[PDB]
Amino acid sequence: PKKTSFGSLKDEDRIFTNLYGRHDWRLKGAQSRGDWYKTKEILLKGPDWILGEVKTSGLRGRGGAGFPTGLKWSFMNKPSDGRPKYLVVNADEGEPGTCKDREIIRHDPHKLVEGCLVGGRAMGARAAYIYIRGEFYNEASNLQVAIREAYEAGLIGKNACGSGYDFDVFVVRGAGAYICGEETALIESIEGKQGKPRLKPPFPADVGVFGCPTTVANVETVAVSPTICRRGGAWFASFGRERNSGTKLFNISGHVNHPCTVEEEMSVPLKELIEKHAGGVIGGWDNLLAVIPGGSSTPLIPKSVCETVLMDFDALVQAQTGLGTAAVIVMDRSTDIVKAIARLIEFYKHESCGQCTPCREGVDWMNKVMARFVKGDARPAEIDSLWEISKQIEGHTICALGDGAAWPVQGLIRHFRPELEERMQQFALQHQ
Amino acid sequence: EAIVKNYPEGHKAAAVLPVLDLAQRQNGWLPISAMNKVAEILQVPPMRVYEVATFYTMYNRK
Amino acid sequence: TQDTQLIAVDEKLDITTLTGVPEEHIKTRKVRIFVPARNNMQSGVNNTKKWKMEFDTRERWENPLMGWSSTADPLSNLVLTFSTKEDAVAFAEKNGWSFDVEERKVPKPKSKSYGANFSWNKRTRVSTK
């Protein structure tokens, strides 16, 4: 009837079966692994049926925010006012701890291409723009080899798959900016400007890239869709809990015996992931200090919280953190957590686009303050100031980079204030 | 030319990043003359190419 | 309306003989009734709300001793404030000052659309942000 322990996903129900590149990644291998199967029928069922199945699966955003996919994709169901419509696949993957998108674009690129076709048909888009980060040169070239095979086989382009739908897939490499993972900053980076995010009340579904209706989607969100439509949608919904449904790619990095990328059933306990797939934290589970669950934006949790937490959006939101990109960065007890969070804040300072005052000035301010916190060169009355500054950045910026910089600070202050004050007191004792 | 035809007519300023990257991959880096050449080729203002050059960290301006 | 022995009076109020102003500074002065323009250096509109009465500026010379700015105009600094144009013109008329009053200039309403900055086929699209 119902599930209560959402783990131990089998190989049969894993979407990304060429995750480690141990099979052919080209068209011939991908076809034998189920790809590009009855795509003509999926397209001919119509956009309404495809979107209905994407809603039935309960799939949410796999690139952070986790907004439901079927509802987001249905903003394009409107009739055309003359302007073109595009699907913009987000392949930037700039979040520290996250390397899951990199693995699809080079070992299952045809999954991404056919997901582009299925989704763009669902949104009624003429072309797909895959914006990959410029650092993924080999992955981008693998993706474009796959796109070339899809074109030469008639699966993309004129009369795509025999459906009569005309669809193009263009790859546009980035040039070294993490802010270009943000959907509107990505849009403006496609348009040849600085990667600065736009103010939202004009939404990408109305005014997107080139000023046309667009939907920006993560690589995994796009790539799972052909298996969602071809396997049932109900089949996808039978994995994980309610709301947060399906399966996810997990990046386990940090103080782990076997850091790895694995596909595990959603709502999996963090313990099962770390022990079964990652081989456990070095020194055992007793040696665990924090774990950052969903990439650098998601605030850390302590070992007590991480002891009995489940890996989905709702369970991790209950734990004052987020699921983010399902990039778990575990830290053993031999870790300077203040140094780690200061390094993350330094990353966010280096990646701020500088457009808006709170991110531009405040993230730099928080980096300056956190650098002192590593040395202890501060008074304990500055911790509350750091909290207030982070809340002043949070909810006051154009994009979510300010929020994702303020959140690691809050997660450090929330669970490791004694360590910060201990460092400050040691510094006061050393420097009289 | 193959890069420029990937974007709709009237929106070829969308090729500044890949054309600049091609300039870097040929020359090795971006002298200001390469920035001016890209601006001339795409008929965008040179300052617009300067912004893209100085914003994206993969561009070697030295 | 009240027992004050209401006496009929003309509707041309003239208090010039009672103000004590010398006769030169009534007939020869020309006051300006206006709403002050917004200082273009700032974008605050709180100084463009009341009506002003200013006199015509006269000669300022240089003091031979110190090089200071001298004046013989008693009304060089006199600036009155009013809530409406009508109040200002009534005050100028009962004081016998010749005036020119200009209509208040307010900003016209403007259609601001952030989404125009990313137009698909219009010149309103911006090349930088």
Ligand SMILES: Cc1cc2nc3c(=O)[nH]c(=O)nc-3n(C[C@H](O)[C@H](O)[C@H](O)COP(=O)(O)O)c2cc1C
């Ligand atoms: C600073 C920042 C970086 C982001 N980077 C990525 C990224 O690399 N890949 C991604 O898929 N989404 C990224 N996102 C999230 C996108 O803005 C967007 O919400 C998402 O791509 C929408 O598709 P989804 O609903 O399928 O996740 C980023 C957001 C922010 C604020």
Ligand code: SF4
């Ligand atoms: S929050 Fe930071 S990255 Fe986002 S628009 Fe503002 S300044 Fe730029």
